[PDB]
């Protein structure tokens, strides 16, 4: 049973802030490692928060490296782990396409993964899609926040 989109979207909003502020909100070892400068990429951390607070607890599993927040819940810090985790709890992706544009996702709302090459620190970006925009920044072909990233795939699960 996938989380509801509205709840997911509202939870994401709460962590749609820079990594230092994500650390302030989550506390515990998450904040400690962020304050130490060890965790920079907040992406898997945000989605860990969303999933944790929308009925999908992040497990204590060797497959997915985690640390705890002040809530004593678990948070993944590697985007590759979050990407691998999502199908194990959401089932098979509804949509998976090469050369991703919003065309393939019109009228859809849910969780989206953009994967590609060009970010040395990340194989992709995991976020929410509401049918028009993403909950932080999209990374379709030609998206303005891509930087050196070039998307080769988008994978998606409908929520609601």
């Amino acid at each position: 049973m996938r989380p509801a989109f509205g709840a997911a979207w509202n939870r994401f909003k709460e962590v749609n802030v820079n990594v230092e502020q994500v650390g302030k909100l989550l506390g515990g070892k998450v904040q400690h490692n962020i304050d130490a400068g060890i965790f920079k990429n907040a992406c898997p951390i945000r989605m860990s928060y969303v999933l944790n607070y929308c009925g999908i607890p992040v497990p204590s599993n060797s497959k997915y490296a985690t640390v705890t927040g002040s809530d004593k819940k678990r948070y993944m810090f590697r985007v590759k782990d979050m990407i691998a985790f999502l199908p194990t709890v959401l089932g098979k992706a509804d949509i998976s396409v090469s050369s991703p544009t919003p065309a393939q996702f019109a009228g859809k709302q849910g969780i989206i993964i953009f994967t590609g090459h060009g970010w040395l620190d990340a194989t992709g970006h995991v976020t929410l899609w509401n049918g028009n925009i993403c909950s932080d920044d999209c990374h379709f072909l030609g998206s303005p926040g891509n930087g050196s990233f070039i998307p080769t795939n988008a994978t998606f699960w409908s929520l609601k």
Partner: protein, 98 residues
């Protein structure tokens, strides 16, 4: 010509490079260079398969070993070299295992 992918390094080297880059960040008398070194370290972090705890403990080992003073014929403190010595030290070595 083309640079190698991070995935072409061994897991050991990935951890060593994390330690080295993070050391550089700690000794750099430069805000821009520190941010660069820590962003760089976070790329090795993502590539590693080691638990967070290994990195947390390694950071403590780093702070302790950085206090060691080394020198050479030049008047500086050879900290850049020290960063590599630290990455490859016996004290860091067990943190290379899960």
């Amino acid at each position: 010509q083309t640079l190698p992918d991070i995935s072409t390094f061994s897991q050991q080297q990935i951890f060593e490079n994390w330690v080295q880059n993070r050391c550089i960040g700690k000794i750099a008398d430069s805000k821009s260079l520190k941010e660069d070194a820590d962003a760089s370290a976070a790329a090795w972090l993502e590539a590693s398969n080691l638990p967070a705890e290994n990195f947390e403990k390694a950071d403590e080992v780093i702070v302790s070993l950085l206090k060691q003073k080394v020198g050479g014929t030049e008047p500086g403190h050879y900290q850049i070299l020290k960063c590599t010595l630290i990455a490859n030290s016996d004290a860091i070595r067990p943190l290379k295992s899960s």
